[PDB]
Amino acid sequence: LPVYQGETTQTLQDYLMWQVELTPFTDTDRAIATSIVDAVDDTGYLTIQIE
């Protein structure tokens, strides 16, 4: 069977954005937000400095 199971999963970072979508904010706030939660580890602290 072509796709067998192929169950797309959660992934944490993926989980972080699902609530980003239903948080209310502006385009600039949603842009920085994608930036921030883009740069976040499996452990969960962020990789890059805030500056």
Partner: peptide, 16 residues
């Protein structure tokens, strides 16, 4: 729930 990677369709008959 969770969808598939091919054709992006959900699982189906109560499977997970």
């Amino acid at each position: 729930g969770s969808y598939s990677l091919v054709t992006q369709q959900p699982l189906g008959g109560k499977a997970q």
